[PDB]
Amino acid sequence: VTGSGKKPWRQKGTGRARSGSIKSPIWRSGGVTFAARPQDHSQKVNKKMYRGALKSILSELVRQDRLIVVEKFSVEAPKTKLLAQKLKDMALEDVLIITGELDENLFLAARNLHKVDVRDATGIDPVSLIAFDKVVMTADAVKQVEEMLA
Amino acid sequence: MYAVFQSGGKQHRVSEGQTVRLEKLDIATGETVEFAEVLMIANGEEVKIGVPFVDGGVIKAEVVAHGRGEKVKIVKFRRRKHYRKQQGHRQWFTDVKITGISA
Amino acid sequence: MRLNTLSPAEGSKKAGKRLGRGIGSGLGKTGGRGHKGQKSRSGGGVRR
Amino acid sequence: AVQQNKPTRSKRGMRRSHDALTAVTSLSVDKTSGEKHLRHHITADGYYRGRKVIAK
Amino acid sequence: MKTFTAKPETVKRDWYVVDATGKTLGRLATELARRLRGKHKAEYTPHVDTGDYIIVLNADKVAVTGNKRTDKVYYHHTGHIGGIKQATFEEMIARRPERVIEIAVKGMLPKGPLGRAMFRKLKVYAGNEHNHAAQQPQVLDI
Amino acid sequence: METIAKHRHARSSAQKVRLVADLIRGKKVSQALDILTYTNKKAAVLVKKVLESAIANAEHNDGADIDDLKVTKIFVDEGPSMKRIMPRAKGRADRILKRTSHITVVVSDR
Amino acid sequence: ARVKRGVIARARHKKILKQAKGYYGARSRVYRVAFQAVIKAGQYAYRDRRQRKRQFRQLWIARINAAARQNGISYSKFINGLKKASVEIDRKILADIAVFDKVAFTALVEKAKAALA
Amino acid sequence: MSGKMTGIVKWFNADKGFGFITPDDGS
RNA sequence: CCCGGCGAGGGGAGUGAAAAAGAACCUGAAACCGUGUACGUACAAGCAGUGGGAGCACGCUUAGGCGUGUGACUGCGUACC
RNA sequence: UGUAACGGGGCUAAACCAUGCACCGAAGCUGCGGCAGCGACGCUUAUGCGUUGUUGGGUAGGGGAGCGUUCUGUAAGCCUGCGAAGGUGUGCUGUGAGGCAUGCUGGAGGUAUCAGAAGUGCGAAUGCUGACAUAAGUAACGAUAAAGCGGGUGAAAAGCCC
Ligand SMILES: [Mg+2]
Ligand SMILES: [Mg+2]
Ligand SMILES: [Mg+2]
Ligand SMILES: [Mg+2]
Ligand SMILES: [Mg+2]
Ligand SMILES: [Mg+2]
Ligand SMILES: [Mg+2]
Ligand SMILES: [Mg+2]
Ligand SMILES: [Mg+2]
Ligand SMILES: [Mg+2]
Ligand SMILES: [Mg+2]
Ligand SMILES: [Mg+2]
Ligand SMILES: [Mg+2]
Ligand SMILES: [Mg+2]
Ligand SMILES: [Mg+2]
Ligand SMILES: [Mg+2]
Ligand SMILES: [Mg+2]
Ligand SMILES: [Mg+2]
Ligand SMILES: [Mg+2]
Ligand SMILES: [Mg+2]
Ligand SMILES: [Mg+2]
Ligand SMILES: [Mg+2]
Ligand SMILES: [Mg+2]
Ligand SMILES: [Mg+2]
Ligand SMILES: [Mg+2]
Ligand SMILES: [Mg+2]
Ligand SMILES: [Mg+2]
Ligand SMILES: [Mg+2]
Ligand SMILES: [Mg+2]
Ligand SMILES: [Mg+2]
Ligand SMILES: [Mg+2]
Ligand SMILES: [Mg+2]
Ligand SMILES: [Mg+2]
Ligand SMILES: [Mg+2]
Ligand SMILES: [Mg+2]
Ligand SMILES: [Mg+2]
Ligand SMILES: [Mg+2]
Ligand SMILES: [Mg+2]
Ligand SMILES: [Mg+2]
Ligand SMILES: [Mg+2]
Ligand SMILES: [Mg+2]
Ligand SMILES: [Mg+2]
Ligand SMILES: [Mg+2]
Ligand SMILES: [Mg+2]
Ligand SMILES: [Mg+2]
Helix, strand or coil: CCCCCCCCCCCCCCCCCCCCCCCCCCCCCCCCCCCCCCCCCCCCCCHHHHHHHHHHHHHHHHHCCCEEEECCCCCCCCCHHHHHHHHHHCCCCCEEEEECCCCHHHHHHHHCCCCEEEEECCCCCHHHHHHCCEEEEEHHHHHHHHHHCC | CEEEEEECCEEEEEECCCEEEEECCCCCCCCEEEECCEEEEECCCCCEEEEEEECCCEEEEEEEEEEECCCEEEEEEECCCCEEEEEEECCEEEEEEEEEEEC | CCCCCCCCCCCCCCCCCCCCCCCCCCCCCCCCCCCCCCCCCCCCCCCC | CCCCCCCCHHHHHHHHHHCCCCCCCCCEECCCCCCEECCCCCCCCCEECCEECCCC | CCCCCCCCCCCCCCEEEEECCCCEHHHHHHHHHHHHHCCCCCCCCCCCCCCCEEEEECHHHCECCCCHHHHCEEEEECCCCCCEEEEEHHHHHHHCCHHHHHHHHHHHCCCCHHHHHHHCCEEECCCCCCCCHHHCCEECCC | CCEEEEEEEECCCHHHHHHHHCCCCCCEHHHHHHHHHCCCCHHHHHHHHHHHHHHHHHHHCCCCCHHHCEEEEEEEEECCCEEEEEECHHHCEEEEEECCEEEEEEEECC | CCCCCHHHHHHHHHHHHHHCCCCCHHHHCCHHHHHHHHHHHHHHHHHHHHHHHHHHHHHHHHHHHHHHHHCCCCHHHHHHHHHHCCCCCCHHHHHHHHHHCHHHHHHHHHHHHHHHC | CCCCCCCCCCHHHHCCCCCCCCCHHHC
16 A cells, blocks of 8 residues: 555554554555455366266256257358358257357358357367257267267 | 133133134134133033033134244343344244133 | 256365354354464464 | 533433523503514614604 | 233222221231232232222320330431431330331332332321211221 | 425524524514514524515415414524634644524414 | 445344334434343343243232132132142132132132131 | 644644653552 | 525526436435424432333224334343453 | 341241141243254155154354355346335244335336355444534633724624724
């Protein structure tokens, strides 16, 4: 705290309480007693625990029928109107679309829709696999997920 | 006419047509209880005193309603000994209405 | 299985002590420290 | 020479029980000009018991 | 139900005349304070004056046992610093003999506004006569 | 029909003014004006100028005859206290309070 | 973060200050005094739930002793009569009959005297 | 109005006016 | 427009969704100070309450009596840290 | 300092001794109802369900289980100008921390559930800051060099001007 390290009054003789610093955390505009620092909240997850969780939640999405498997899922031109038409034909609104390739027209056509997210099969995460209502996997992306996860 | 009977560990002077709040019984809210152990029946200079209870006397009542009493707050406090407790309590009861004192 | 259906295991997460927040908590004014010692002082205690 | 407890507002009102003002009972009326004044005082215009005792 | 309480409006009180000739002081006075308290009535209530008006006569002819006629001492204090005073039984009988009965009953009554109201019903007279014939008082033997 | 007049931020103590305001509560205004005329307090000058304003507001703004008017409510509230520093001996300072008031006079028929 | 505690401390003080209605002075106005007065009232209430049962039994006994001595028997002779006659009427009901139905109390006294004789 | 200097350092007691009113009897 | 000192301040009128948004201006708690109404209080002694409890006032109601406020008198009772 | 060496009144028993029968008398015991803990036993446990005993004063201190607050996800969801939060009342409810509904004010935000993180709960620290009391409408109004009158101005003159 910007201040001075001088006693606001002497120790005794005056009728007031003892005080040593105006920077005291009991004063107005004093310090915070246990003032915080920039800290890192990242936790370690074991590799086998991360894969156990993914193999668990993909088993649960299968048992809950929240997993859709198609051979290919492409949009010809990078248009969100075309993607919204295709998802309306699939009866999908809130969906994660994992694809084993880099489709730029699909990324751009899915970038503006907040109900829709498009990932690579490598860039999948458990919180997305839970937060989305349906998950569409390319059969190749299934083959890649099965290969990473044995 | 009045009568005296035991219920809930305590006794009750009661005339016909009165509503008496008793301690909780295991009886539905419309059924009929019969208090056979009656202690005294007075009918206007026609008393009979149960030496251990009146023999032929019985009180026929209809259960009006069950319910819980008013909330009370129990405060325990040991001064300068860093101790207090709080506890509320509501006591179950059962209001009955006397259909008739069969002497 | 949603993000508002998950729950940890029983006994996994334990609450943790919060000293000096009332009589009923148990950890009252002194907080497991007794009265007027060296151990009750801030930073007090003897070395190994 | 100073208190040890704060005296209540009840005692404050009881001390102020006698501090009430007495309104003037009745204003005397001049017999000539008919205006009201204090008894045994002159009027504002300068009358007292009828006559004009001082011009103004 | 709830326990009956007497009510000061609906309560009835009666008048009694006691002759105090030859009777023991304290054994009279505890029956007087019993009947001023109202502990002889089934509608007794502690916070209600349920006792009876009592006229006590021949108060100067009350009897005490032992040497208490010359040895019982009535001390009191005037408030002033030397103000301890002292009077014997037969001096109180000569000076103002009603105080002896009044003090004994006042000591046997409860202390407070209700006990003072009970004491207001005690009406003592040194002689054998009273002006309270208008209240049609009954006799009482104690 | 009630008619209100107020002198807010009256530079006077509320305790000093309530002595005057208690003289004329419930009175007819011709008697209250005569009491305030021959009362020697400064608060009588204040509350008289307020009672005169309430009378003129009741006559102009509300249509009321003066002889039937009557002081039904009068009350003095505590105002903002401007505060000044008065020096005492040995360098000690005391913070005096310079009290204000809010005089309110309600005059009416009913 | 930074929990600001005005709402909670206000409602917590108002829970006490509502309980302190009727009290004299700062006991109904000031939280430091009211809380100190509410706790004493809970202590007295816990105590006087026990003392109610004493004081009414004492009242009942004094009324039975008066009505029995009106019928010419003491309390201690009358309870012993009702024990020997097995009459298990509690002395709430005996005080009620002694007030409202003096005939039945006379009959109880005569039962107790005949049980002793 | 710019009315500070009331209880700032209470110099009131920084005066620390001599105490010990000739009472060294409590020795 | 009016009272007022060609004041302060206020009452109208007017604006505005709102002036209990009027510049001392969002919401406006508490301490504190008032006005009004109900009850109690001038023979009465103490942590000021609690248990009982008359009476009074006010609402409901099928009168059943419940509530609400007050609290004469009375048992017990010497704050917190 | 005052009775002041039965608690008092008072007592010649209302004192003492002996015996006896009554009764009063505690939050003890019993009765009725309710909660919880720990053990038995059995079930067929939803891993807790009957019965069953028994236990339940408590500082330092140890252990177990919870309420509520702010923020993040759930939530581009839900509630909300047909009135949010907040403020003030009332009623109901829970063993408690608390909760719910609603009247009035207010006039725009709030947030279930299940998880997560804490600047997470104040009456005290001769605690800090601001506001308001008290004493109290009391003390004082600063050299005991001294004032009085007329006229004027002015809303008003002991204090201004002549
Ligand atoms: Mg230095
Ligand atoms: Mg800071
Ligand atoms: Mg790694
Ligand atoms: Mg300590
Ligand atoms: Mg030590
Ligand atoms: Mg230690
Ligand atoms: Mg340190
Ligand atoms: Mg002190
Ligand atoms: Mg005065
Ligand atoms: Mg006593
Ligand atoms: Mg209040
Ligand atoms: Mg103006
Ligand atoms: Mg706004
Ligand atoms: Mg505002
Ligand atoms: Mg307020
Ligand atoms: Mg009276
Ligand atoms: Mg009186
Ligand atoms: Mg006194
Ligand atoms: Mg009560
Ligand atoms: Mg002496
Ligand atoms: Mg013996
Ligand atoms: Mg008992
Ligand atoms: Mg027990
Ligand atoms: Mg049981
Ligand atoms: Mg325990
Ligand atoms: Mg126990
Ligand atoms: Mg402990
Ligand atoms: Mg949120
Ligand atoms: Mg509204
Ligand atoms: Mg918020
Ligand atoms: Mg609210
Ligand atoms: Mg609201
Ligand atoms: Mg904190
Ligand atoms: Mg605080
Ligand atoms: Mg503390
Ligand atoms: Mg403090
Ligand atoms: Mg302070
Ligand atoms: Mg001050
Ligand atoms: Mg003052
Ligand atoms: Mg003084
Ligand atoms: Mg003086
Ligand atoms: Mg002076
Ligand atoms: Mg001067
Ligand atoms: Mg002049
Ligand atoms: Mg001069």
